[PDB]
Ligand binder design. Structure first.
Ligand SMILES: *[C@@H](C)[C@H]1/C(=C/c2[nH]c(/C=C3N=C(/C=C4\NC(=O)C(CC)=C4C)C(C)=C\3CCC(=O)O)c(CCC(=O)O)c2C)NC(=O)[C@@H]1C
Ligand SMILES: *[C@@H](C)[C@H]1/C(=C/c2[nH]c(/C=C3N=C(/C=C4\NC(=O)C(CC)=C4C)C(C)=C\3CCC(=O)O)c(CCC(=O)O)c2C)NC(=O)[C@@H]1C
Ligand SMILES: *[C@H](C)[C@H]1/C(=C/c2[nH]c(/C=C3N=C(/C=C4\NC(=O)C(CC)=C4C)C(C)=C\3CCC(=O)O)c(CCC(=O)O)c2C)NC(=O)[C@@H]1C
Ligand SMILES: *[C@H](C)[C@H]1/C(=C/c2[nH]c(/C=C3N=C(/C=C4\NC(=O)C(CC)=C4C)C(C)=C\3CCC(=O)O)c(CCC(=O)O)c2C)NC(=O)[C@@H]1C
Ligand SMILES: *[C@H](C)[C@H]1/C(=C/c2[nH]c(/C=C3N=C(/C=C4\NC(=O)C(CC)=C4C)C(C)=C\3CCC(=O)O)c(CCC(=O)O)c2C)NC(=O)[C@@H]1C
Ligand SMILES: *[C@H](C)[C@H]1/C(=C/c2[nH]c(/C=C3N=C(/C=C4\NC(=O)C(CC)=C4C)C(C)=C\3CCC(=O)O)c(CCC(=O)O)c2C)NC(=O)[C@@H]1C
Ligand SMILES: *[C@H](C)[C@H]1/C(=C/c2[nH]c(/C=C3N=C(/C=C4\NC(=O)C(CC)=C4C)C(C)=C\3CCC(=O)O)c(CCC(=O)O)c2C)NC(=O)[C@@H]1C
Ligand SMILES: *[C@H](C)[C@H]1/C(=C/c2[nH]c(/C=C3N=C(/C=C4\NC(=O)C(CC)=C4C)C(C)=C\3CCC(=O)O)c(CCC(=O)O)c2C)NC(=O)[C@@H]1C
Ligand SMILES: CC1=C(/C=C/C(C)=C/C=C/C(C)=C/C=C/C=C(C)/C=C/C=C(C)/C=C/C2=C(C)C(=O)CCC2(C)C)C(C)(C)CCC1=O
Ligand SMILES: CC1=C(/C=C/C(C)=C/C=C/C(C)=C/C=C/C=C(C)/C=C/C=C(C)/C=C/C2=C(C)C(=O)CCC2(C)C)C(C)(C)CCC1=O
Lengths: 161, 54, 67, 160, 161, 160, 161, 160, 160, 160, 54, 161
């Protein structure tokens, strides 16, 4: 995977040059953002279970999926969705802390589409749950940390879409 | 009445970072000290004690 | 290659077009012999009327020497 | 980098980054100004750093340029300077990133296959990187010397 | 897989017949090839690393392929392409000593184009890699043995290309 | 010995030796006189062939005995002579065995690690064993040249 | 289109009979002429742009036809005139090789008089250009070939006139 | 005629004939004497070739002249023989012309629809024209047989 | 004329010449005095402008006036001066009209076929028209020169 | 190749090869000996043929090498002669194939774009290939010169 | 006693098919007669009768 | 395809928001750049025919590409190459007028990479050719307009990269 610090390194090394003023400025910008990134990651890790709980409550619970026959039925499947939402949140936090959404398409988005197609998972329902998680985290971590988390979660959703 | 007589050779491709051409003059700048031809024939060496034994 | 030349007036019977259409309403065109039957049938189907036609190219009644 | 290393380590255990990882990233991002300045310093002396690095290497191991060596003429010595600048750039990448993994991603995976398929004595390459470390530490502050010497030393260890 | 000898055997056996004169003469032809093929195999096995070494040194080495941006960059991909050339040389030697290309398209051509496209490997660059391998082998195996080396390596390129 | 290899393959297949294996050991046993003649010739003329091939290796690669090479110092060139003696004796052992198992397991398996620890340029040893090959071909008969060269080619390729 | 062969074939088939003596004689005459036909065709094809070039140069260039007011003024009209002359020369060659002008009035004479009259093209200038083509072709091909090309060019001028 | 096809193909490209087409015209005008000789030979004995071919078809397809047949009856047999003579004349036309354009333009375009209107087993007609080809080849020179049979056989294939 | 171009473009979509075009025709009719003045400026000095335009063209490309070239003879160079005068008049027509449609309708459609039938190196024609443009810019009063540069440059583009 | 567009024409019409095209292939295959002889005679006499053709081209039209010309450079003359060699090879390929397929499909399609990009007049190279035809007919047998000049006429006219 | 200095610049490349190299010297043998510098005024040509009136 | 103005309008429409201060500042920036873009467009359409000439002369003349065996030998290949350069120049000028890379994504770079790969044409040599035309166009259009042209040309190279 790639982050904001090694993204500049790869970008400079593809042409083989050293780190010039532009690369230096990009690194300083990432280091400036690192404060908010670390604070947001710590806060999200502290409240991951509650965040996924609230996102499930306002986006999936008491609907057709949770009713019998639905894909939320068969409590093993409900735990599978809880685990999937936890995975999405944790990998979004990874991408936000890294500063680049390359881990998302390398450890999350890789093969997810046909995974859900074979399992018959509601892709739009999962997308809606992801925006619910985005809204919940944005209301708990602030405006800018929520900004970055929403950016990476929306990248995940667009990969899903 | 100047005329541009374009020559045979293709326009020389601009030197890149990977190519050691930009280092080539540096090598001549280095001028590394080479080594004389070692004058040993190995015929007069006898392998019973000439080999180390410690 | 024994071509016909046909003048015909095919009107529009389904839509009211707001762009100029004399070019495809009343026209004189050169149609190949092998395509003349199909063109005549199609123009008849669209309500067009074959105003006039004559063998512009070729000679009538030739058994050989058509291509 | 260090952030990538922490993310990978957390992913291995399938958990969020621990407070140790988080405040390590905290300290790294806070102190990144010194690391970027040291990378700038190494970049600036690039031509000279390569110059006396190669000079000291050849004076220490002339066989690589001597008759029978891998780099006999000025052409192959220029190729050595090219690889030498490669690994200087790798050490700069490590300093800015703060973690050795990009070096592994660039100039340490399958390096033995490279320098066996080329006949290059990898021990001589290690000595050249050691001359990197010595002269570069000579031309920078002692604490900054150790900060760069971490990555130079890691490259040396991957050499031998 | 199958070679010329196995080719005549299974060609006779599919019709359920013994060795007719046609199989007899193609077996004579393959036996006449004989010592030449095995001698070429031994000479190839002798300087086995040398063919790939000078093949890299002639075409791929010292170019934009092996420079930054090119797929040859970094030590990992250099060693990877060296391993690829080693596969190609060993399998060309196997096909030569067998005299058939069934080993190549049963062990190389199946999915190799798509597996390089997944990694985005330059098909053309590999093409002249095997091309240079052709004359590097021909300079050590002779003309006729070098000619058959060229034939089999061209088959490898065509399957890859 | 090819007998041991055939027995190993048959035991792996849990079957008695096939006609191909029986013919293989039959040809080996019937032709053992030539292999013994090669072994005796190599043992008798070992000292001259090793010295001549070492001289030719020096002529190709003078840097190995230049002041700073692994072979530099009369001790460190006598050790090359002893190593060439060891490899020649290994080739003699293999010639009387019919296979390359003793060569593989006495001086081939793990040779790269030993020569990395000692710093020896393994490609230089490949050139040296090549020179041993030409010397043996010169001193030895034309028809046996193929048999000896097969083993020399195997050792060169594996140890290259 | 009727040539020297298909004309005889059609004349025989309209009466529904085989090749009689007169058809024999006329087909023999065409067969004798065929050698000179092919030679003149090669001669014309060799210099196809040339004859039109000197014809326009000697009969059209530097006159009121090309001056302001003439129909050949402007680049579009000049190119149209050149294209028309090239068409006339090519169809004259075709009628030469066929031995009949049936193609000549079948392809290039289809309403050309009406087209030129509607466009206001000068018929006299067109006939002069055709004649200028005529002597150039006659000089390049020979006497009898020149005459047999001139007959077709006269067919062109009569159809246009 | 072959020349008509030549100008047709050339005008399709809006260019003078290629060297191949001019070569075709030259060869055709040269061989027109032999082609006209073949046509005269077929025309002179035509009532014999058509006659023998019709008889032979009658042996090969007795159903045609069997009761309930399309050619059953003296008048229907006469009509079929008239068809045979028509197609022999068309073959002579093609031979003199040099190509098969007149054959298609006269007796091969829409022949299937015509015989469906007449309800004729066109395969038997192809067999009849094959018999005509054989009868013509029997009474004509061997070299001329190839040229005549080419056009007879094109007629057979298009009508088969 | 810009009016004609606007009319045709509106007719392409069956519109009523939307105000985004009507303001342009209004501005053109208002400012036509400057374009007319440029017209007299180019008309009065047409002789000199074409003359040193041909001078510059010959200085850069003396092939055409050379004995091997197309313009040799002092009558063919007269023809080049005549053609340059024609294209200058066409550029005047374009500048007075307001657009390039008269230029295409007069001396740009089928120009390649015109100059291929004459052997003219049309690239030389483009160079001569460019030098005419430069001479006009020298004679024209800056912004008027820039305005006429549109027509001269459109002739340059369509001529090559 | 005559057969290649013969088969292409047949496939475009969805029909087998006609008797006329078959006979043309017949004559081509039977007379291919002369075509191969002409191929050998053109390959052997390449240097003198191109030399005399280029010299007569230069002497007829000096403007190609006159001041400001596209071939004023001493290297430009050799590039032009390389073009001469290319077209000579194309003519040889076409005479070998018995058809003008390879001339058009190697060095004719888009040559006008070639020369507009590089500025070389088309008429000049047409005259050059005319000189090639003249010298080739001078060096060639009369009957063979007929076909060689026919193909040269094709290339000159189509490229003219 | 030497080492073939490893060349990464492809020096000593034979003139292959496509190179106008092979014609340069023969062009030297041809030695084309470049036409003299024309002296045309292009300033005093009264263009009213110098243009043909055919 | 959208220009800068339409791109801003679509971006505002995506959020369902009016044109805020960033919208007007970007619009005014494009309006200021419109003068330069129009004049550069006139200058580049001035020499679009000739500019590609020296663009290819200093990039792809008398090299391995033009000679036989190279992917630019034969009149079709050279013509397609010059036409590809003309296409790149024209479409980059289109983007410069529009001031957006949207046109290149769908009308130029869409399907171009695998098209070249299937054609086998050298993509790297195309990259250097586009760089050469970059300096050639910068020479005539100026520095700032040259930079605007060069950014689009480098975008084309990166897409083809
Ligand atoms: C009171 C007796 C206890 C209690 C129950 C309780 N449950 C919910 C909500 C849900 N219960 C389920 C359970 C299942 N779904 C399944 O598919 C299966 C069988 C395969 C089970 C057992 C689910 C999925 C939900 C939420 C979704 C939905 O209701 O459709 C609630 C309400 C929770 C809320 O916040 O809305 C309650 C009260 N809770 C207790 O404390 C008692 C022990
Ligand atoms: C001399 C009297 C004629 C002449 C020659 C001339 N040619 C060039 C440059 C080129 N010509 C070619 C030609 C071909 N490429 C092909 O693939 C084919 C065969 C399939 C041909 C015929 C090419 C590729 C070039 C460029 C590279 C090269 O030289 O090989 C020049 C140079 C012109 C310039 O400005 O570069 C010249 C002078 N020019 C004339 O005017 C005469 C007709
Ligand atoms: C109306 C007051 C009078 C009338 C008109 C009428 N016209 C048509 C049909 C057509 N009218 C045209 C004319 C034009 N088309 C053009 O593009 C232009 C040039 C810009 C003109 C002048 C054409 C071409 C048609 C036929 C095609 C079409 O309509 O698309 C009709 C319909 C006739 C019918 O039965 O289809 C009518 C009624 N008729 C009157 O009685 C009024 C005096
Ligand atoms: C110099 C003191 C030592 C030495 C070096 C040496 N290297 C080469 C050739 C190459 N080196 C590389 C290495 C890399 N390329 C990469 O992209 C990476 C990561 C960025 C690495 C590590 C390569 C690829 C080559 C091949 C040529 C090329 O760069 O394209 C040579 C020359 C080999 C030859 O024969 O040409 C030399 C001499 N050799 C020694 O003995 C010294 C100890
Ligand atoms: C070398 C000739 C060219 C080249 C190639 C290149 N290959 C890879 C990576 C792999 N290549 C293979 C090869 C094979 N897989 C098979 O099944 C077969 C048949 C046995 C072959 C030959 C494989 C397995 C890999 C991936 C696994 C691995 O690395 O061992 C790379 C690296 C790709 C990357 O970094 O993702 C490269 C560069 N590159 C060149 O420049 C040569 C022209
Ligand atoms: C001169 C720098 C270049 C050149 C030109 C050239 N042209 C001619 C002859 C004619 N050109 C035309 C046609 C037009 N010229 C125009 O300006 C326009 C206005 C739209 C048109 C249509 C005509 C009519 C002629 C004369 C033929 C005729 O009278 O119909 C020549 C002389 C040709 C001749 O054979 O006399 C020349 C030299 N040629 C070059 O080489 C220069 C690059
Ligand atoms: C030149 C020798 C004389 C001349 C020619 C001229 N012709 C036109 C316009 C047309 N000419 C034709 C003729 C044909 N088109 C064909 O396809 C063929 C058969 C294959 C022929 C014979 C046609 C159809 C047109 C009109 C359509 C078109 O543009 O092609 C013009 C232009 C007239 C105008 O008003 O634009 C001219 C000038 N004029 C002379 O003065 C010469 C004697
Ligand atoms: C020139 C810099 C390089 C080069 C060019 C080259 N291209 C082709 C063929 C094609 N090029 C294209 C590309 C486009 N067509 C479009 O409409 C557009 C949209 C913007 C683009 C980019 C296509 C589609 C083709 C295939 C069809 C065609 O024949 O044009 C060729 C010929 C390929 C062949 O097999 O004939 C060539 C030579 N070649 C080089 O070596 C240069 C680096
Ligand atoms: C090439 C090569 C190498 C080998 C390299 C070599 C050969 C290295 C060897 C280098 C040598 C021979 C160094 C000599 C050092 C002697 C010193 C410092 C003694 C000083 C004495 C003093 C000051 C005494 C003064 C005095 C005092 C004070 C008194 O009290 C009064 C008198 C007295 C004089 C005694 C390597 C091994 C590196 C690598 C492999 C390889 O091939
Ligand atoms: C095979 C074949 C066919 C042909 C088949 C054929 C050959 C068919 C032909 C069949 C024939 C020969 C039919 C004739 C029948 C005669 C009748 C009904 C007359 C009766 C007379 C009467 C009642 C008069 C009685 C009387 C009266 C009342 C008087 O007033 C007093 C006296 C008198 C006696 C005159 C087909 C055509 C079908 C198809 C093709 C094909 O191949």
């Amino acid at each position: 995977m790639q982050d904001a610090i090694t993204a500049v390194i790869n970008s400079a090394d593809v042409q083989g040059k050293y780190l010039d003023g532009a690369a230096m400025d990009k690194l300083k910008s990432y280091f400036a953002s690192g404060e908010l990134r670390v604070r947001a990651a710590s806060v999200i890790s502290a409240n991951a279970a509650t965040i996924v709980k609230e996102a499930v409550a306002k986006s999936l619970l008491y609907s057709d999926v949770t009713r019998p026959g639905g894909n939320m039925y068969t409590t093993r499947r409900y735990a599978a969705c809880i685990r999937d939402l936890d995975y999405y949140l944790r990998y979004a936090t990874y991408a936000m802390l890294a500063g680049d959404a390359s881990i998302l398409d390398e450890r999350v988005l890789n093969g997810l589409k046909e995974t859900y197609n074979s399992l018959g998972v509601p892709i739009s329902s999962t997308v809606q749950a992801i925006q619910a998680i985005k809204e919940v985290t944005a209301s708990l971590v602030g405006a800018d940390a929520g900004k970055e988390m929403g950016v990476y979660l929306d990248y995940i959703c667009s990969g899903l879409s | 009445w100047q005329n541009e007589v374009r020559r045979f050779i293709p326009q020389e491709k601009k030197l890149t970072a990977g190519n050691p051409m930009n280092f080539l003059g540096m090598a001549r700048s280095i001028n590394p000290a080479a080594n004389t031809i070692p004058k040993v024939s190995a015929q007069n060496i006898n392998i019973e004690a000439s080999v180390p034994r410690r | 290659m024994r071509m016909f030349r046909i003048t015909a007036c095919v009107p529009s019977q389904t839509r009211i077009r707001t762009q100029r259409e004399l070019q495809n309403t009343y026209f004189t065109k050169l149609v190949p012999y092998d395509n003349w039957f199909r063109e005549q049938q199609r123009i008849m189907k669209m309500g067009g009327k074959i105003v006039k036609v004559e063998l512009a190219t070729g000679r009538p009644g030739t058994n050989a020497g058509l291509a | 980098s260090i952030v990538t290393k922490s993310i990978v380590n957390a992913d291995a255990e399938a958990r969020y980054l621990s407070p140790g990882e988080l405040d390590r990233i905290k300290a790294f991002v806070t102190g990144g100004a010194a690391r970027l300045r040291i990378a700038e310093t190494l970049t600036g002396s690039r031509e000279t750093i390569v110059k006396q690095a190669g000079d000291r290497l050849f004076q220490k191991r002339p066989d690589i340029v001597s008759p029978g060596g891998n780099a006999y003429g000025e052409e192959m010595t220029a190729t050595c300077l090219r690889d030498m600048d490669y690994y200087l750039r790798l050490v700069t990448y490590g300093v800015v990133s703060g973690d050795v993994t990009p070096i592994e991603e660039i100039g340490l995976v399958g390096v033995r296959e490279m320098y066996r398929s080329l006949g290059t004595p990898i021990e001589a390459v290690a000595q050249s990187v050691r001359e990197m470390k010595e002269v570069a530490s000579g031309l920078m502050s002692s604490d900054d010397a150790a900060e760069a010497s971490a990555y130079f030393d890691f490259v040396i260890g991957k050499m031998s």
